[PDB]
Amino acid sequence: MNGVYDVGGTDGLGPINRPADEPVFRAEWEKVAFAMFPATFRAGFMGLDEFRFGIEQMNPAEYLESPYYWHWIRTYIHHGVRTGKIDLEELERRTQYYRENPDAPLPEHEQKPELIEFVNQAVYGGLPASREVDRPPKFKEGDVVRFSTASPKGHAARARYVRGKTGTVVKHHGAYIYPDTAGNGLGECPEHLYTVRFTAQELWGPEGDPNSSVYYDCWEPYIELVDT
Amino acid sequence: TENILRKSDEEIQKEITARVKALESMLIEQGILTTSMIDRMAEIYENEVGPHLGAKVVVKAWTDPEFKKRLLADGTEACKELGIGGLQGEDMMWVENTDEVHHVVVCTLCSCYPWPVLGLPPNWFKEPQYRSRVVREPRQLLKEEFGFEVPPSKEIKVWDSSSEMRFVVLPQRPAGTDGWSEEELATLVTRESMIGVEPAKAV
Numbered sequence: 001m002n003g004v005y006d007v008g009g010t011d012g013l014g015p016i017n018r019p020a021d022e023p024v025f026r027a028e029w030e031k032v033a034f035a036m037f038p039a040t041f042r043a044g045f046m047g048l049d050e051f052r053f054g055i056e057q058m059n060p061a062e063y064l065e066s067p068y069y070w071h072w073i074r075t076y077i078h079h080g081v082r083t084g085k086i087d088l089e090e091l092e093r094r095t096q097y098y099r100e101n102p103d104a105p106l107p108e109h110e111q112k113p114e115l116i117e118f119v120n121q122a123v124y125g126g127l128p129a130s131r132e133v134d135r136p137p138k139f140k141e142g143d144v145v146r147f148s149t150a151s152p153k154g155h156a157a158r159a160r161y162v163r164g165k166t167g168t169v170v171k172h173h174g175a176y177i178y179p180d181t182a183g184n185g186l187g188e189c190p191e192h193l194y195t196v197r198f199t200a201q202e203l204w205g206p207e208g209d210p211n212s213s214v215y216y217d218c219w220e221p222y223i224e225l226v227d228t
Numbered sequence: 229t230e231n232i233l234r235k236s237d238e239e240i241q242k243e244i245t246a247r248v249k250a251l252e253s254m255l256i257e258q259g260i261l262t263t264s265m266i267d268r269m270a271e272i273y274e275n276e277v278g279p280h281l282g283a284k285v286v287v288k289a290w291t292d293p294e295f296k297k298r299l300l301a302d303g304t305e306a307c308k309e310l311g312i313g314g315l316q317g318e319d320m321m322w323v324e325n326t327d328e329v330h331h332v333v334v335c336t337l338c339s340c341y342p343w344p345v346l347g348l349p350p351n352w353f354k355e356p357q358y359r360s361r362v363v364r365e366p367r368q369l370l371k372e373e374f375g376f377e378v379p380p381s382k383e384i385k386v387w388d389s390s391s392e393m394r395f396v397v398l399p400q401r402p403a404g405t406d407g408w409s410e411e412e413l414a415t416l417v418t419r420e421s422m423i424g425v426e427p428a429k430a431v
């Protein structure tokens with residue numbers, strides 16, 4: 001997509017806000033929003049690429065200024081509605097209930113140990129996105145390649161500032177889940193992954209530092225050969 | 229930044245709190261979320277997983293050339309030697325700062341960050357201000373925001389990471405530390421030094 005979340009090279013967003021010491025969670029609701037990720041993932045609301053696509057569909061002004069974990073809430077609701085797992089009218093009624101009764105209890109429920117075992121296994125075992133494929137990589141270190149000018153409306157990892165630009169392959173990492181399919185409900189469709197180096201002058205013109213480059217991750221369909 | 233359209237922080241927090249509690253109540257009734265699940269995730273990322281883990285990796289690299297070689301060859305496998313790994317760091321690649329190269333990491337499209345060695349990202353890393361500028365004016369950003377002057381002849385490599393590869397910066401060992409213990413060296417290693425926005429602590 002071409003939304004306002006694609007900020008690389010944007011100007012005018014303001015100075016960095018870096019409070020000299022900050023807690024991991026700034027309020028109790030942030031802990032809840034954070035932990036809903038494993039719950040909704042296990043229940044089939046979304047995978048990782050779909051999760052990001054939900055955030056990308058936020059109101060742009062809301063995205064730019066709302067607390068980070070509010071973006072997570074928006075994507076849970078987006079995918080809950082998409083999958084039929086969340087009824088919006090019931091959510092709106094419960095929201096008004098907790099507006100009027102902020103200290104009312106949560107529903108009675110069993111503390112099912114398998115859900116905590118799931119958390120521990122995910123955290124310490126991981127959820128690897130690498131996949132084996134049947135063909136070798138098309139490209140290799142040192143190849144000069146050009147990044148696609150395609151501009152899909154669906155999820156992708158094609159920052160506007162690299163589209164159409166020419167760079168050099170730095171490393172081949174193996175094949176991985178492809179965001180352009182996975183984030184749009186089309187499956188993993190794994191593709192070989194590379195890091196490609198683009199000079200600051202290639203990216204930004206003469207306002208470019210002659211001694212800086214950006215290393216950008218390119219799945220195989222993103223790039224085509226210039227010079228072997 | 230002043231936006232005349234924006235409600236007070238207190239009103240925003242009040243509304244978010246009610247919407248989150250309402251969603252929480254529905255996921256609880258569906259049987260897919262529990263309060264104990266929430267408490268476990270908070271305990272892990274408040275107390276068990278944080279930048280002290282990455283600091284152990286850095287100091288081993290500083291004090292063991294054979295480990296440093298393994299770390300640069302395969303970051304995931306090397307960190308596993310220390311029992312460090314897992315969610316959001318399944319594919320770590322460590323990059324070495326030198327007298328000739330300085331590395332800095334960003335995710336311009338999202339929030340990719342190596343949780344097993346750093347914990348969850350600080351808010352500034354996830355926010356649009358850092359993300360927009362560091363790919364375009366890294367040398368100026370490091371000086372103005374972080375007080376870190378990288379001389380103009382020294383190459384800056386900005387890793388804009390949208391894949392599941394997780395790039396982690398191995399900062400240079402500060403001068404004046406010959407023969408220090410691993411515990412003493414760890415006091416110089418910060419999360420900022422492993423993102424590349426600051427060097428390891430001097431003195």
Ligand SMILES: [O]
Nearest residue numbers: 335338389390
């Ligand atoms: O990213």
